[PDB]
Amino acid sequence: TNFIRQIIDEDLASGKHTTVHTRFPPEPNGYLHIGHAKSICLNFGIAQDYKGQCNLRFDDTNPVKEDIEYVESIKNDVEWLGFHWSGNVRYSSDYFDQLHAYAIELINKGLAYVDELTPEQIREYRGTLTQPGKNSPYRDRSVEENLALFEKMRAGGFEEGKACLRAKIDMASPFIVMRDPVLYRIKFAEHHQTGNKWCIYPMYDFTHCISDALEGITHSLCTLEFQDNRRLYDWVLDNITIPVHPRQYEFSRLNLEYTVMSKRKLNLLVTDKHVEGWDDPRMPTISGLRRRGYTAASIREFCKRIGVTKQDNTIEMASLESCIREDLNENAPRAMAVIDPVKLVIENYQGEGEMVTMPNHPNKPEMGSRQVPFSGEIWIDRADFREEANKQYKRLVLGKEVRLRNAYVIKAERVEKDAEGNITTIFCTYDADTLGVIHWVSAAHALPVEIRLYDRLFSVPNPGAADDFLSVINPESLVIKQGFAEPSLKDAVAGKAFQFEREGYFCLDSRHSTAEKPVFNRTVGLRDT
Template sequence: MDDLIPLFVKVGLTEQKAKDTVKNKKLAPTFERVILESGSVNGCSKETGNLLYFLASKITKDAEVHLPFLSRKIASGDLKTTEQVSAAIAFLDEKLPPIDEAAFNEEAGVGITVTPEQIKDVIASYIAENKSNIEENRYRTLGPSLAATKKLPELRWADGAAVKTELEAQYLALLGPKDERDAPQKKKKEPKPAPAAKSTVEEAAKSVDPAATVKKMFFEGEISNLHKPGGNKQINPELMKKHLEVTGGKVVTRFPPEPNGYLHIGHAKAINVNFGYAKAHNGITYLRYDDTNPEAEEEKYFTSILDTVRWLGFEPFKITYSSDYFQELYELAIKLIKKGLAYTCQCTGDEIAAHRGGENRGPRTACVHRDRPIEETLKQFQMMKDGRFKEGEITLRMKMDLENGNPQFWDLIAYRILYTPHHRTGSQWCIYPTYDFTHCLVDSLENITHSLCTLEFRLSRESYYWLCDAVEVYKPVQWEYARLNVTNTVMSKRKILKMVNENYVNGWDDPRLFTLVGIRRRGVPPEAINNFVAELGISLYNAQTDVIRLDNHTRDYLDRTAPRLMTILKPVKVVIENLPNDHLEMLTIPNKPRDPAMGEHTVPFTNTVYIEAADFREQDSPDYYRLAPGKTVGLLHVKCPITCTEVVKDANGNISEIRCRYENGEGVKKPKTYIHWVADSPKHGSPIKLDEIRLYEILFNHANPSDKTLVPEGYLSDINENSISLETGAIAEIGLWDHLKDWIAKTGGKDLESARWQFVRNGYFCLDKDTELDINAAKTGNVRDAAKRLVFNRTVTLKEDSSKDDAAVRKGGIIDTRKKRA
């Protein structure tokens, strides 16, 4: 659209503003149309150009049909101010052609001019009447005064900027320049009452309740301006009357996924928007399966979609299927044919594409079947229904408008033949409605008030309205918002299926994917996803969002709710030589530091412990603070620190154990660093062996692996070879059993991925579905005996300043490997 920049500059925009306008995919085409309709292609005065720009940015959906008329009124000089343009739009917003021009002129102030002298006199009179208040409260009254003067009948059609300038000049003449008396006064903060102590888990759950987190999304920005139920005009007022009788004036939305794959992170936004908008307005939301393609639909997708919606915290008012309405849709197709607005077409796919202009976008032409007689079309459509044609041999197309520049008007296909049995209707039907025919009509049949969808359906809005009006049914409003795209992944079902089939990933729920089943398996809480979506808000412009933002919400939630567990990924043995072999202390450890509500558990401390191999270095350095020969470190939750006295190696030169001294004497300084540990205490079952820990990173190296300029060899070539690594020798402290027992008590052992921890200094982890844990045995007996295999997934690393990675390595911090890539 860069070719529009010179045109926009011609009508008075600066080059920079013209460039910014071109980037606005909604405003730019509207502004271009306004310029063309006004006859200003070769330029106009800056004042006129500003008004045309104002018109393009303020025109409403209902008044858009009058855009040519309004553009010409500005070009002719009939509308001279933004106030007049706003009034003109408001007047026409409720009108259908033709226009009563006399009434329009009166409402829009056409022919009325307010001179600078008149503005000056009216302002002077206003100030005289309010002088005492103005002198007492000075410039604090300026804003209210401006609002009040604009409402004066004498100034209704005055230029707003001129009114503001004159008012400020007369304030200055009366009061002089602003001084310290006009400085805003700071309000004294009242002390807040001390909050009652609450569980962190309860507080975190409350703070991310879906109804609370998404509500703010709908009362600011463009979506806050959507019509109220009953406010969308219909071709026949009786349709709205019947609609309101059914809905009672409630907001009704729907989430309509196709059951041909698993939902992805983008669907999380759609779920939040549709369910959230209805919730915010005390309305209801349908979960409607758009099951019009029996070739691609499977029961597992239906089950997964409902499970995912509920996992995110939403409950449908009703679960429906597009197939519920097959008979009604068929009858509406018959109605369309009888009105001469549909025809049976026997063109091939290539022929249809050619008639639409082909790849070179040439002129569009009608096919030979377009003028087929109505009776013949009805007969052939019945033959289609009776199974007397082959698949692909014939379709039913809508007779729309081939001259319209919108491709969604190029005689879209309404019905096609498929002999694949349907999962619900079996072989009852062999003709199936297309998305373009089904979507709007089922919205109508379900009395949807707000059909909320993503921007790729913007062009479909006009054809959506056309079809509803053509068959004379209630017409919902379609409104589009930007879809959610995140970096370093692909969300195309086709691309994911290829990766699954060719073993690049381990199924649709591979934790490296951004399918919602994959994210869930990785341990990301639904509350974090909802918070992520709420933070992004509802934009009208597509953009790519860094996956790190989701990671941050995941960390924030898990930091508040996950119990801490000391876990060693690569253990090395430490023997404390001045403690006896039978030394035993039972230490009480909080499940979360400084949060008593999270509870506590006990672990043994003996003269033999295990620490992370990364927490020891044979060669010390001044900026290294963990364990080294002759160096002292603290052990988390242990009273005294330890000092390394000796390093023992095996025949191959590998460290077999580190010998240390327990510094329990007087005068020992507090250590600079504390490290975590796990005791060796066989009688307590410590340490616990963890069968497998899976460490995940981003799956693709580039932010947009589908961008051929960045990844010329295709997205599969961009897969990060180090996106998963396995640890099979890890161990954990025995607090794990207490945590699992608590988790089973709270959840019934449902959904293994909801068992989450912070592995101290290592990151956040959850149980994987490959874990073998007999929940029934665990409920009635010993959790330890019920656990046959323990497999963990890393959900996200601990947060760390990436600019200090080197220091983090030296001092024991954990690097966030999930960084933004090129």
């Protein structure tokens, strides 16, 4: 439960509503990020719980900022998250004729007029946060004139910015949004849905409340910054001939530590090529989280966990990680991979190799087991061998033994280094029958794999607050490695993740994995303490 569901309840109880109809109206001007997932879960979830309906609407009123790639991606992420919208996908543009009709109603009612103040003049007449605005000298034209003028605008008769339709409200309102808000502006730009049919487009404030009412929305859910706008939302509806009046309720938007959560800043990263694209695994986009190996369900749980309030918040990365870790911990089948390898030769070993049995999930036998190839020339992780080091160190030391994961116990005896004194191979003996603990990979049957270790995009907790958020990017947000995985992974499915034992959860694809060179993305590392 949350404040919004309590309102909904009271409406249902009072009889003000007998059904609930919500909506997710992003503008198709960028890819969806996790903040939008909060909104999708909120709106689509309320619908299903209250046995109602929730539409997917593309708030497409600004042609110059939108693209068809985005509408396609949005529909894709919404689906991927696991939600279904009510009926067809809607578009604000579906109402362009209705909106133009309604603007004509406001004009006929004397509540709208065509202003000729330049875009600079409008701001100048607008007033300040503390000084009232002032009336345009064109504010009192007749209905007849406004009608003619608006038609002229609509017919491509005015150059851009040369005129616009403004609402006639109160230029001295403390609500700056109510100071004659612009209803229509001229843009000779082709729209991704209406092509070149219109040269005039409606503004957000005029469009949204009307789109909401036409679609029969009962509870319009948005974020805190449209609180002031709710006044214009109501004004518009209160002043036109429309049978319903949806009510807007605002909740705080999501802020995630170490990243930005606004399409504008995410676009800059894509545009400036500091990430591969909107779906880069380091990106907080739904596509990027998906490509990183995150499950729709872990995201759904994150949104459930964070809540919906009016408090400005900033969630910690540990919260999101917790969610994905919980999921993958339960479901990911375990595997063996070595991110940083060094060859270890069991001189004691005789043969061409053998096959040891390995559980697909050390705590869930029902998930079965598999046969993994063992031998005398395996691969271990460099950090798992210490010629020296403290008593706490539970891994391989130059005179100590260690249990090879699901195999035998071995003993390091003679190391071998190179020119720069770096070790090249470790010589050990194995106890013919012995079956800390360390993972390994038989060099002979090993599959060469590229491993991508992801990390926080930015060096600071709140990069969006920085003057130049880009200068504070983390140069180690992506560190690529070349390791070895058990041949098993030869059939790994893109997107699906496994737990690389003692390392973390990894998934294939990355838009890079080929048959020859597989690319594994580390979704999240295990809890190291």
